[PDB]
């Protein structure tokens, strides 16, 4: 196998504070097929004006 990095020497993991309300925001983002949002180009063949 391989080692990504040497084992951490930290005595303890850094403190983390979780607040769901602050993170939550109203930002609706509907994916649009007309704007080809998040659409994968066909890997099998390239296409012209057709």
């Amino acid at each position, epitope marked *: 196998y391989v080692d990504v990095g040497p084992d951490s020497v*930290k*005595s*303890a*993991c*850094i*403190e983390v504070d979780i607040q769901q309300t602050f993170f939550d925001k109203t930002w609706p983002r509907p994916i649009d097929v007309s704007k080809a949002d998040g659409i994968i180009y066909p890997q099998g063949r390239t296409y012209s004006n057709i």
Partner: antibody
Amino acid sequence: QLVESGGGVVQPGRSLRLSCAASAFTFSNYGMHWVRQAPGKGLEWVAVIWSAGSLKYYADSVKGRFIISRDNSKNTLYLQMDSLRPEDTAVYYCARENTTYYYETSGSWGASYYFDFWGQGTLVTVSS
Amino acid sequence: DIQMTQTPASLSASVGDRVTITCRASQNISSYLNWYQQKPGKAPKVLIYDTSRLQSGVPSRFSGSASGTDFTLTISSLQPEDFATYYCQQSCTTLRCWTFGQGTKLEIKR
């Protein structure tokens, strides 16, 4: 508040039950554990357990003789002592243990320590 | 193994006296070294947590400085009430075992 109960005179080589109960405290939020002291000897330790309770730590003097089981809903910690000896006789204190963890990006540190409500302690005597 | 010794098992000092108490570990295994003062019938109180920052609720007169493996605690304006047994504990996350202070008694000199 951590209070230890069930401490009493105990016959040698018998199971001894010690219960430490946290009052108005969330057992799951902080690891809650123990520590020990005998006359003529320095304040040593007894037993540290994680909030999950998977991690087990025991005093060097006892080779796993102490057994620690805790339930967060129960808010109580149970310690079982076996092969009791006159030297083993001591007063046991149960207290939650905390450490300070932070990254000094700009001299930044947080104490994050809760040694408050340290256990008063109970005395178990091995005598016949 | 790890060997810990305190230079004075019992120390006698007058009131308003300047004294140093030193506890020596086998080696400085970890940065965090905590000094504890114990009063009989009372729970142990941590004088200092890492010997670099004084613990909250602890008087400025107690100062902990560690040079080499040995750690020195300096006290000034000593009081009969102030005198108490002193224990030093070395805390390492890697090592399950916790160092135990010898317990240096402090008494009035007259």
